[PDB]
Each structure stands twice: as C-alpha cells, then as structure tokens.
C-alpha cells in the first residue's frame, strides 16, 4: 500500500471516463485549429517553427512589433526595462520579423546535433581500428595541428561567450533562438577541436593533448595576437547585441574564422596526409553555413531592408564593418605568419596559394555580406594588406 490516494486516471477509469464523456460537448466550440493562426507567415504556408516560436516574447507595443501593452511589472534598479530599445542602436518596424531559414526550434536542433554526436563516436572507434593515422605527416600533426588548431579553440570559445549578453538582451524570440543555437555551435567547435586532440593522444605515444601549449599560443603567440584582440572586444568590449552578432559572425568569423578553419586547417589537412581533421572541420563548416543563413536573414532581409530604418541600420552596419574588418585584416596579417612554419607545397603554402586563399575569403565575404549592406570593399587591397604579413 501507500499513504496517499492512488489517483484514478480520467482516460481509463470507467467511472471518471463516463463523467468526462457526459461533460464534453458533442461539437467543437470553434473551427480555428491553427495554433497562433494570426502570425504573418514568412513562407507560402505558416510553419510549425513559426507557430512554436513567434510571439513567445511578451513585448508591449512600445517595443516595435509587440502585441501587449503597459510597462513591465518589475524593472532594474534605476529603471532599465526588462527588455528595451536602449539595448541596441538598430531599429525596425517589427523585431519579430526574423526567421531562421533552417526553421530550427529546439527539437530539430538537438535532433540534428544528436546524429552528429553518435556518428562521431562510431567514426572514431572505427578510425582507431583502421589505423589510418599512420600516414599523417608527423610535423603537421605535432607542430602545426596539435599546437595551432588547439589554439584556435580559444577563438571559438570566445565567440561562444560573446553570446551571453545577446541571450539576455535581444528583443525577439526567433532572434534569441538563432543566437543561442549559434553559441552552442561555437562552444561545440571548441569542444570538438579538443576531442580530436584527445583522440590523437590515444593513438600517438608522446602526443600531448593538454591545452597548456594551445593556451600559451593563443594568449602570447604573435600569430594569434590580432585574433585574440578582436575576440576579446566582440565578447567583452560591447553590449549592443546586434553589434556582437554582426561583428562576431558576419565580419570576424566570416573572414578570419573561415580562413583559419577552412583555408588553413581543413585545406592543408588534405595536402599533408591528415585523414582525421576533415571529419571535424566538416562539422564546424556545416555549423558556419547554418549560422550564416540565420545571421544573413536578421541583418540583410530584416534590418538592412526594413522599410523605415534600412538605411539608418546600414549606417551603423557600415561603421561596424569598417571597424571590425580592420580588426580582422590585422588578425589575418598576424595569422599568415604561421605559413613560415609549414612545409612548402606549391599552390597551397607559397605566396600564390595564400594569395588565392585570401581572394576566396575576401571575395566570398564581399558577395555574402558587404554587397548586401552597401559596404564598398576593394578585395585586392585587403589581400595585399594581409600578404604584408606573409614571409616570402
């Protein structure tokens, strides 16, 4: 037995189910069965993603797009509102407009990352069983990958933490989801770099997966000096949550980040016989493109083209881009000194190869971001500024 009643279930208990059946009307009391039917659909039909996310944020009419009214029930000492317009320089006719093109609410987001989580461990168990690490160039493995890819985890980690004030401060539900998923993907990147190093240590006697050397490199090696300065500024030097997201993803990570992850470690992995690192950078680069789709929508579709404030927002976005592009060019100018430490491979690590890598990165960026906010950029001038740090 037990001290408390064993409650009978209304669904199956005969007496309670009969009482319920008698109370339930024999017809529906409305025909409108579409959850939050009044949301304005972005696409040809309202999505479940929109239904579960949109207007969960309880904004009042004095925060553009809000459907509620009145002041907040409790504000900060001094008067700062629970959410407010003072949180960012940008303006819009409706903060709810943003849509992630991937339509991630929480469930598809963790469904997809779970697939990657489980398949990664199966791949590692088989990769170790294969012995394929045997053909990796040992200098790359030990002196470039372990040390400088390790150090890169600190850039991913700082970009992750840049999102903490964004998660508190930003002004709508779909934006908050975009920001938080982006942050988890960044801290995942840092954790995945560390997982690869820990995995190599199990296969290569004497290989040290401690973060001691990567951290010393991140914090004191001139190669990462500019990158660390920019990350520290984006994370802890500002609180405008649109500036954090823009400077973090659309400038710094789209130029320095993409160069380091994709042009350096992923690309050179397939020139030095590294059959392992591409499995890991496949994940960071997939995450970068998913994050980009959502960052693009917030800043290009919504803010740069908002009917009333698009040019106003472009004024700030252009000022931000000038500042953080300068920061990122300096970061890349420092970073390409790393090439002085690698074994020369024609077309990859010589001046022509690095010039073409920077042309892809700055050329892609001009197309993906600069052209869409009206930011003029001379690609060749940015390439040449970075190449000044290349040791011939």
């Amino acid at each position: 037995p037990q001290s408390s009643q064993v409650t009978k279930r209304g669904l199956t208990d005969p007496e309670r189910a009969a009482i319920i059946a008698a109370a339930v009307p024999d017809h529906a009391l409305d025909t409108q069965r579409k959850y939050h039917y009044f949301i304005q659909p972005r696409w040809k039909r309202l999505s479940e993603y929109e239904q579960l996310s949109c207007y969960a944020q309880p904004n009042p009419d004095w925060i553009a797009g809000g459907l509620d009214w009145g002041d907040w029930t409790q504000k900060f000492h001094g008067g700062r509102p629970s959410w407010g317009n003072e949180s960012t320089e940008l303006r819009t006719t409706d903060w709810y407009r943003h849509r992630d093109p991937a339509r991630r609410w929480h469930h598809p987001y963790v469904k997809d990352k779970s697939e990657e989580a489980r398949y990664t461990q199966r791949f590692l168990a088989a990769y170790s069983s294969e012995g394929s690490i045997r053909t990796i160039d040992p200098y790359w493995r030990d002196e470039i990958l372990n040390k400088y890819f390790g150090a890169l985890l600190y850039s991913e980690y700082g970009l992750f933490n840049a999102h903490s004030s964004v998660g508190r401060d930003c002004l709508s539900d779909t934006i908050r989801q975009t920001a938080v998923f982006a942050a988890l993907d960044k801290v995942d990147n840092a954790q995945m770099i560390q997982m690869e190093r820990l995995f190599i240590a199990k296969l290569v006697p004497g290989f040290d997966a401690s973060t001691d050397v990567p951290k010393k490199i991140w914090t004191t090696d001139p190669i990462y000096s500019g990158a660390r300065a920019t990350v520290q500024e984006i994370w802890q030097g500002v609180q405008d949550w649109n500036e954090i997201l823009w400077a973090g993803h659309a400038v710094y990570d789209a130029t320095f980040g993409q160069f380091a992850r994709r042009e350096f470690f992923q690309r050179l992995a397939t020139v030095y016989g590294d059959t392992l690192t591409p499995f890991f950078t496949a994940q960071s680069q997939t995450y970068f493109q998913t994050t980009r789709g959502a960052i693009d929508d917030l800043f290009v579709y919504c803010l740069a083209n908002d009917s009333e404030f698009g040019a106003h927002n472009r004024t700030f976005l252009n000022a931000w881009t000038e500042h953080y592009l300068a920061s990122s060019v300096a970061a890349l100018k420092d970073f390409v000194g790393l090439y002085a430490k690698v074994e020369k491979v024609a077309g990859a690590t010589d001046r022509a190869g690095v010039s073409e890598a920077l042309q892809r990165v700055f050329g892609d960026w001009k197309i993906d971001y600069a052209d869409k906010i009206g930011f003029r950029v001379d690609v060749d001038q940015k390439v040449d500024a970075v190449l000044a740090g290349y040791k011939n």
């Binding site: 009214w69 900060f76 317009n85």
Partner: protein, 168 residues
Amino acid sequence: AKREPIHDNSIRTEWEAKIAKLTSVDQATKFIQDFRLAYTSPFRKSYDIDVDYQYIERKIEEKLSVLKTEKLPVADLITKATTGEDAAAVEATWIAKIKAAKSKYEAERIHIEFRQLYKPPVLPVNVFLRTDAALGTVLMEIRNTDYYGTPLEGLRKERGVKVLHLQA
C-alpha cells in the same frame, strides 16, 4: 475619465505630429530630454499621458536616431552624446556623481536622472549600458544595506508619500 483605445488614439497621433516637425539633432535632443524629464520615472512632472508616454518615447527615439544617421559623422555616433559632450566624459561624470551620493535617496535620483538625460539615442548604446550598469551596482548596494532596518511608517516618511488610506 474615459481612456481612448490602447494602440491608436488622439494623444499618440498628436504627439507623432509634434515629432514630425523635428528637423535637427539639437532640436530632437532637447525634445527627448525635455520629454523624459516631464513624463518618465517616478519623478516626472506629469502623469497626463501615462498610458501613452512609453510608445511616444519610442517614436521620439526613432526620429532622433534617423536624424543622427542622416546628419552626424560616423565618429560622433560612436564617441559623442547628441548634446555634443564626449561620451566617455559623460560616463566618468555620472559614475563619480553616484559614488559620491550620501544616501540611497541621493543615489536613486542620480541614476534616474542619468537615464532621463542620456538614454539612447542621446548617448551611444555601448557607453550608456556600461554606465547604467555601474550606476545600478552602486544603487543596489546602498539600497540593500539594512533593507529591513526602517519600519514602514518611517519609510513612508522618508519617501514623502501622502498616506491616503491604511486598512486596519
């Protein structure tokens, strides 16, 4: 008496027509500062537009911000208040002001007035947020010292309320 509808009414419409006449940063800055002193916070001069002032404030902010981007050089948007003052100087001045306050009553008015005067778009957002947080830190600490030390009858007097009713 009888309030008009919540989201569309003659008070908001009339204030929007006033805002539409603002044509310079200087004029909009005096407009928003005077508005925030007259109609926001417990120390406001008037509750005559209580259910509309927050929306109206948003519309003034939008006008001042567009005027800033149309007229000011980029560097002014980052480093200057629209009063023309240096933003970092504004920060230092008000932090020192609140740290010199001698009671929670002095400190609270300094914080409240900083926001009435310098809320964005008057001060750049980044500078404002870190200034507002530094002020709030000081104000919270002094208010949460011996929080229960004054009986309600005493707190009522210190606040200066007119007690209209106390149920037995």
